[PDB]
Every structure is written in C-alpha cells, then in structure tokens.
Amino acid sequence: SVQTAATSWGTVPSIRVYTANNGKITERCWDGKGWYTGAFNEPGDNVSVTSWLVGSAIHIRVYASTGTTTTEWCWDGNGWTKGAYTSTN
Amino acid sequence: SVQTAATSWGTVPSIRVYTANNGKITERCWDGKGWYTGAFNEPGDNVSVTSWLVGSAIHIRVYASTGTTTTEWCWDGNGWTKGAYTSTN
Amino acid sequence: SVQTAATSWGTVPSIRVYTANNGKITERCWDGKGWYTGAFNEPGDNVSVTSWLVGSAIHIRVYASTGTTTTEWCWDGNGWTKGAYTSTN
Ligand SMILES: CC(=O)N[C@H]1[C@H](O[C@@H]2[C@@H](O)[C@@H](O)O[C@H](CO)[C@@H]2O)O[C@H](CO)[C@@H](O[C@@H]2O[C@H](CO)[C@H](O)[C@H](O)[C@H]2O)[C@@H]1O[C@@H]1O[C@@H](C)[C@@H](O)[C@@H](O)[C@@H]1O
Ligand SMILES: CC(=O)N[C@H]1[C@H](O[C@@H]2[C@@H](O)[C@@H](O)O[C@H](CO)[C@@H]2O)O[C@H](CO)[C@@H](O[C@@H]2O[C@H](CO)[C@H](O)[C@H](O)[C@H]2O)[C@@H]1O[C@@H]1O[C@@H](C)[C@@H](O)[C@@H](O)[C@@H]1O
Ligand SMILES: CC(=O)N[C@H]1[C@H](O[C@@H]2[C@@H](O)[C@@H](O)O[C@H](CO)[C@@H]2O)O[C@H](CO)[C@@H](O[C@@H]2O[C@H](CO)[C@H](O)[C@H](O)[C@H]2O)[C@@H]1O[C@@H]1O[C@@H](C)[C@@H](O)[C@@H](O)[C@@H]1O
Ligand SMILES: CC(=O)N[C@@H]1[C@@H](O[C@@H]2O[C@@H](C)[C@@H](O)[C@@H](O)[C@@H]2O)[C@H](O)[C@@H](CO)O[C@H]1O
Ligand SMILES: CC(=O)N[C@@H]1[C@@H](O[C@@H]2O[C@@H](C)[C@@H](O)[C@@H](O)[C@@H]2O)[C@H](O)[C@@H](CO)O[C@H]1O
Ligand SMILES: CC(=O)N[C@@H]1[C@@H](O[C@@H]2O[C@@H](C)[C@@H](O)[C@@H](O)[C@@H]2O)[C@H](O)[C@@H](CO)O[C@H]1O
Ligand SMILES: [Cl-]
Ligand SMILES: [Cl-]
Ligand SMILES: [Cl-]
Ligand code: NA
Ligand code: NA
Ligand code: NA
Ligand code: NA
Ligand code: NA
Ligand code: NA
Ligand code: NA
Ligand code: NA
Ligand code: NA
C-alpha cells in the first residue's frame, strides 16, 4: 500500500496529507475550499510529519525515508528546504 | 507488523490509536478512564490521522489506504463519514 | 525502508523523531540547539506517537508494534515506562 502522513493546524482547519508511492512523496492540501496538490515532491518510501504555528505562520517538518536514510524537509513560510536532521550522530 | 496511527486532544487527554491489521483498521480509545474499542472499523492496510478541537468539539480525519487508493474518514461529533479527499485531481 | 514517527510541542519547538529499523526503535531530539539521540530505545518494527503539554510538562506516548503486538511507552517527565494500552479487550 501507499503510506501516508497527515498534519493540521488552526480551526478552519488547514490539512496536509503526504503520500509515499513507488519511491516518491507527494502532497495534498486543504485550506477550507477544496483539495489541491501542493508543491512538495521529493523522493521517499516512508513519510512522517509534524507542524507548529508561531502566531499565524506555519512550520512543517516532513521526514522522508528510503532504506536506512532519512531526510528532513522544512517549510517555514517560503519553500521546501532540506533540514539539519540526521538519524544518528 | 500491524501499522498504527495516534492522535490526542486536550489535557485529560483523550487519545485515539488506529491499527491496520490484515486489511482492516480498528480503533482504540482513552478518555481518562481506561482503553476501549471505538466505533471506527473500515478497510485499509495503512493508516494516518490528524485531529483538531473547535472549542469543546473534536474533529478527526483518518486516512485509510490500500494499494494506491486512499479514503478519508471524518468524525465531526456524530459518526464516521467518507470525506472529500482524493490523492490526486 | 525504516519507518518514522514525529511529534513536536511549543514554539521553539521541541521535536522528537522515532525510527524503527531492523526491529529496534530509536529516538532523535531537537530542543532548539541541535539534534541528539534520546533515551528511548525499545523493540519494534512500526512506530506511532502523540504528545500533549500540561502547562510546561510534556507527555509523550509511543506505540511500538511488532507482528500483531503493540506496546505503549510513556514519558511523563522522568523516564520511559510501559503503559496500559492494549490493542483489544
Ligand atoms: C533549513 C535549515 O537548516 N534551517 C535552520 C536555520 O538555518 C539557518 C539558515 O536558514 C540561514 O538563515 O543561515 C543560518 C546560519 O547563518 C542558518 O543555517 O536556522 C534556524 C536557527 O536555529 C533553524 O532553527 C529553526 O529556524 C526556523 C526558521 O527558519 C524556526 O525559527 C525554528 O523555530 C528554529 O528552531 C533551522 O532549523 C530547521 O528547523 C528546526 C526546527 C529543525 O527542524 C532543523 O533540523 C531544521 O534544519
Ligand atoms: C463528509 C464531508 O464531505 N464533509 C464536508 C461537509 O459536507 C457537507 C455535508 O456535511 C452536508 O452538510 O452537505 C453539504 C452540502 O450542502 C456538504 O456536503 O461540508 C463542510 C463544509 O466545508 C466540509 O468542511 C468541513 O466541515 C466540518 C463539519 O462538518 C468542519 O466545519 C470543517 O471545519 C470544515 O472544513 C466537510 O469536509 C470534510 O472536512 C474537511 C476538513 C476535509 O477533511 C474534507 O475532505 C471533508 O470532507
Ligand atoms: C504507566 C502507567 O500505567 N501510567 C498510568 C498511571 O499509573 C499509575 C502509576 O503511575 C502509579 O502512580 O500507580 C498508580 C496506581 O496507584 C497508577 O498505576 O496512572 C495514571 C492515572 O490515571 C494514568 O493516567 C495518566 O497519568 C499521567 C501521569 O502519570 C497523566 O496525568 C495522564 O493525564 C493520565 O491520563 C497513567 O496512564 C498512562 O497514560 C494514559 C494517558 C494512557 O496513555 C495509559 O495507557 C498510560 O498507562
Ligand atoms: C501558507 C499556505 O497555505 N500557502 C499556500 C500555498 O502552498 C501550500 O501550502 C504550504 C503550507 C505547503 O504545504 C506547500 O507545499 C503548499 O503548496 C499554495 O500553493 C497556495 C495555493 O494557491 O495557497 C497558499 O495559501
Ligand atoms: C466524543 C467522545 O469521546 N465520544 C465517545 C464515543 O465515541 C468514541 O469517540 C469518538 C471521538 C470516536 O473516536 C468514536 O469512534 C469512538 O467510539 C464512545 O463510543 C463513548 C463510550 O461510551 O464515549 C463517548 O464520549
Ligand atoms: C524534557 C526534556 O527536554 N528533557 C531532555 C532529556 O530527555 C530527552 O527528552 C525527553 C522528553 C525524552 O524525549 C527523552 O527520551 C529524551 O532523551 C535529555 O536527555 C536532555 C539532554 O541533555 O535534555 C533534557 O531537556
Ligand atoms: Cl521557508
Ligand atoms: Cl459527524
Ligand atoms: Cl515519567
Ligand atoms: Na498526524
Ligand atoms: Na476535489
Ligand atoms: Na513560496
Ligand atoms: Na500522531
Ligand atoms: Na484495559
Ligand atoms: Na454518535
Ligand atoms: Na506527527
Ligand atoms: Na547534527
Ligand atoms: Na529522567
């Protein structure tokens, strides 16, 4: 099966659902008006997510794994950027 | 292995744990007094979840996947209902 | 692939990422200053997580599964303790 991860914020709410399928992760988005495909598209076979609001600004962290490798991706209001996470050391 | 997804709300807290096993997803619940089996029972091989409170009312979204198909299930205070989510388009 | 689960709290934030690899789950931690390996180390092939704050005290629940067995682990300010969760009955 594909593998998903979901997060939400606020009371509208906004929702993001990440799906790993055949080695790629894609993103679907709800902001109160319908579902649309988001900008996030990166390699991975497994995905997890968390998020937090600072006032009205959302911060999202997506953990994309393949084999024994995990890469963190970061949204902080502009774009997706690889983060500093490593699984060890 | 079975695959689980967990969410919580409030400070009691309430917890819900969803488990995919042999193509079915079941639900376990804590509201401060012990664990009990919940009403949610739907097909799926993979599960994710998120939730949010509006005041004192919980909203839960369970994303149930099998193969390349994902179905969203919705709790909004009464019962479980299929949602509008699709993985594409 | 390894399988991960992530939670966060506050606005710093703190983040915890749990990774199941080859039958063991390990923990990585961010509290604003860098990533470090946490104290959590228990058997499991699949992991989920949730957490909640009571004021300034974090409570974390990690659901560690192997085959059809799921064990809950609990952090409530001191250490990791097996919880009362069972998947049925
Ligand atoms: C992608 C990344 O590494 N983000 C870091 C951030 O990097 C800075 C760069 O963005 C740029 O400004 O150059 C400086 C060096 O001069 C840094 O490399 O630095 C932040 C400062 O601590 C990191 O912390 C978070 O920053 C967020 C906003 O960008 C936010 O304020 C958050 O609260 C901070 O903790 C940021 O780290 C990333 O986010 C944290 C939470 C972890 O997920 C970490 O692994 C990420 O890389
Ligand atoms: C199951 C579903 O589709 N729920 C929708 C909801 O559907 C309405 C029906 O419940 C009924 O009232 O008939 C009307 C048309 O006349 C709609 O079909 O409509 C809501 C309005 O936007 C959707 O939005 C959420 O509604 C929640 C309470 O029911 C809550 O207020 C939430 O804040 C709203 O965003 C609701 O969509 C479902 O929930 C959202 C968050 C997504 O998960 C979406 O995919 C779900 O279908
Ligand atoms: C590990 C565990 O079972 N924790 C229980 C907690 O057990 C108590 C023991 O810690 C000790 O004090 O002895 C008494 C009997 O005299 C109990 O066995 O009991 C708490 C009381 O309800 C449980 O509830 C949570 O306690 C947390 C702080 O420890 C916190 O206040 C939380 O809000 C309470 O709901 C605690 O249960 C564990 O946590 C809950 C949320 C579930 O995850 C449950 O399965 C856990 O075992
Ligand atoms: C903050 C926000 O909602 N931005 C929307 C745009 O990006 C989408 O949301 C962010 C948080 C991240 O999940 C992106 O990968 C995602 O595409 C979005 O493109 C736009 C739609 O027209 O709406 C913005 O509000
Ligand atoms: C709001 C709430 O806690 N409702 C409980 C009932 O349903 C359980 O919780 C909801 C949120 C959802 O997870 C259901 O699938 C689940 O069964 C529950 O049946 C009842 C137990 O007697 O207690 C209610 O409070
Ligand atoms: C509350 C807190 O942040 N405690 C830190 C110590 O434990 C780490 O965090 C807790 C919540 C749990 O995830 C542990 O398994 C984890 O190791 C930590 O060891 C210490 C680092 O020097 O810093 C504490 O603040
Ligand atoms: Cl950004
Ligand atoms: Cl409802
Ligand atoms: Cl403790
Ligand atoms: Na989630
Ligand atoms: Na649509
Ligand atoms: Na942008
Ligand atoms: Na969770
Ligand atoms: Na019990
Ligand atoms: Na009902
Ligand atoms: Na998460
Ligand atoms: Na480092
Ligand atoms: Na300690």
Automatic annotation (TrEMBL), chains A, B, C:
<dbReference type="InterPro" id="IPR012475">
    <property type="entry name" value="Fungal_lectin"/>
</dbReference>
<dbReference type="Pfam" id="PF07938">
    <property type="entry name" value="Fungal_lectin"/>
</dbReference>
<keyword id="KW-0430">Lectin</keyword>
<protein>
    <submittedName>
        <fullName>Fucose-binding lectin protein</fullName>
    </submittedName>
</protein>
<dbReference type="GO" id="GO:0030246">
    <property type="term" value="F:carbohydrate binding"/>
</dbReference>
